[PDB]
């Protein structure tokens, strides 16, 4: 059924699973027309498809041309997401295909279920977790590849960098969600924390800085503080 705090360790067992987040597939800026009406202009988007155990991110870039001449785009975006996830599953060797796909928003269930009828053994599940995957576009290198795409493209990342050499996938996921929650609540401050110290850099082949274990503890503490600070600024506490 649904995924929540009671079965959280299931994410890191040895059954292949993917989270699918569609919140950055259909992106727009809203603006005034010369006539004083309002219009939208789409920008490039992306499907965020993540293996939480391995960190393997399948970033399908959604180029604005896919919306050309189409109606009901927010509805179409869910079906396009499901189309692309289904295509990805079919492209993977049988032994790499997921046993479960967890969608971060319930409106993806029926589109994905319909597109995966050929895979009756793959469980399509919602989750009660509020996951911050919308903030994926606050990761500079992911945002960059999306905005530069001139055509549909799939780009593969490891969203954990090399962290699994030193920590478990439970801890890596906890770090990721804390970083993304911080970037979602106050992007400017979160990025300031991540780059304040010029001596710690992001390797060319990585997404996040090359923090030592002790430095990650400090960073993690600063991100918690930020989320609490913002919680206080928001609610006046």
């Amino acid at each position: 059924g649904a995924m929540n705090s009671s079965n959280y360790a299931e994410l890191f067992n040895n059954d292949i699973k993917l989270f699918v987040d569609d919140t950055n597939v259909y992106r727009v800026t809203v603006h005034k027309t010369f006539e004083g009406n309002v219009a939208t202009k789409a920008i490039n988007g992306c499907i965020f498809t993540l293996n939480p155990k391995t960190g393997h991110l399948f970033l399908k870039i959604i180029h604005t041309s896919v919306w050309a001449g189409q109606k009901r785009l927010s509805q179409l975006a869910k079906w396009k997401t499901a189309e692309e996830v289904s295509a990805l599953v079919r492209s993977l060797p049988k032994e790499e295909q997921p046993k479960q796909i967890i969608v971060t928003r319930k409106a993806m269930l029926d589109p994905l279920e319909v597109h995966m009828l050929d895979f009756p053994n793959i469980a399509i599940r919602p989750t009660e977790l509020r996951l911050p995957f919308s903030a994926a576009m606050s990761i500079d290198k992911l945002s960059d590849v999306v905005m530069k795409a001139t055509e549909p493209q799939m780009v593969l990342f490891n969203i954990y960098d090399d962290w699994l050499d030193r920590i478990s996938s439970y801890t890596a996921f906890s770090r990721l969600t804390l970083l993304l929650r911080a970037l979602k609540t106050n992007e400017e401050s979160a990025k300031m924390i991540l780059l304040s110290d010029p001596t710690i850099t992001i390797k060319s082949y990585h997404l996040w800085p090359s923090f030592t274990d002790e430095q990650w503890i400090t960073i993690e503490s600063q991100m918690r503080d930020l989320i609490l600070t913002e919680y206080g600024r928001k609610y006046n506490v």
């Binding site: 179409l76 499901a82 029926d110 279920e113 009828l117």
Partner: protein
């Protein structure tokens, strides 16, 4: 006009014949039902006074044979049987009529209710939904499950309604996933009408039969089938105009006939609100929407 005689009434029972119901007391001198209109299927149904568990009954057509009811004290129910000896049967019926031991199918002359509820129901199609080929009549009861219910247990005692499942490969063409899920016209017109039912009359016959089994037996799987066949039409953007007009008439008389006090269990709020107010056909069911709104405005 035809007759279904009863050997006797050894147990107290509420008897129904189509939309009419009457009570018979234990060992009351009762020997059946006369003046049954020829030209329609009929259903004779039972609810024991001492155990309202299991409404059960028999669908039949008097043009196909001479049928009677006889209580079986071993199996504990009123059973329909066929009498092959026609002169024997005629003589039995004539004696019971002379002794005035039979109630009369109370059809008002103006009243087209039963025709309107059974317009497309045909015994031969009933006998393919209810498989028991040695008899010309068909037994249904409260508890019988459908072929689809079993998939999700005895197959001989099943209601073999046509399986409708909106999230199935049958309903969804590869590469038209969104199209076919949001507009079921392919599934209605090509898969079901052209493919399975052959014409809208057979589709409507099964829809009407499902409703009647839901209403008269409280058969839950029949209620599911009735709602599924309505939703499949309402969720199709492209439906022949004559089918929409006929569906409106069919539903109108079903809603008109439904006991007010059973509306809570026989009507699916989600399906009806979708069909009347959100679906492609939301504007095509004028008669049904008007009676629904005046009779069950709470459900909406």
């Amino acid at each position: 006009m035809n007759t279904v005689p009863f050997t006797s009434a050894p147990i107290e029972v509420t008897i129904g014949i189509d939309q009419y119901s009457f009570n018979v007391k234990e060992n009351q001198p009762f020997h059946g039902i006369k003046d049954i209109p020829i030209g329609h299927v009929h259903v004779i149904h039972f609810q024991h006074a001492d155990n309202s568990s299991m409404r059960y009954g028999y669908w039949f057509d008097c043009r196909m044979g001479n049928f009677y009811i006889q209580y079986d004290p071993k199996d504990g129910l009123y059973k329909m049987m066929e009498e092959r000896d026609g002169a024997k049967f005629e003589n039995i019926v004539h004696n019971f009529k002379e002794r005035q031991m039979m109630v009369s199918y109370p059809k008002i002359d103006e009243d087209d209710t039963w025709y309107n509820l059974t317009e497309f129901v045909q015994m031969d199609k009933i006998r393919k939904i209810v498989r028991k080929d040695e008899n010309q009549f068909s037994y249904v009861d409260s508890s019988m499950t459908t072929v689809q219910e079993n998939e999700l247990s005895d197959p001989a005692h099943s209601l073999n309604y046509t399986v409708i499942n909106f999230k199935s490969r049958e309903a969804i063409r590869p590469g038209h996933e969104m199209e076919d899920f949001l507009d079921k016209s392919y599934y209605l017109n090509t898969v079901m009408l052209q493919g399975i039912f052959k014409n809208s009359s057979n589709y409507f016959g099964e829809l009407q039969f499902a409703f009647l089994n839901a209403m008269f037996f409280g058969n839950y799987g029949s209620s599911l089938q009735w709602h599924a066949m309505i939703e499949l039409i309402c969720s199709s953007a492209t439906v022949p105009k004559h089918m929409l007009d006929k569906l409106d008439e069919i539903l109108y008389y079903q809603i008109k006939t439904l006991p007010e006090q059973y509306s809570d269990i026989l009507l699916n709020e989600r399906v009806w609100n979708i069909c009347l107010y959100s679906s492609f056909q939301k504007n095509s069911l004028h008669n049904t929407e008007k009676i629904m709104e005046n009779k069950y405005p709470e459900l909406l």
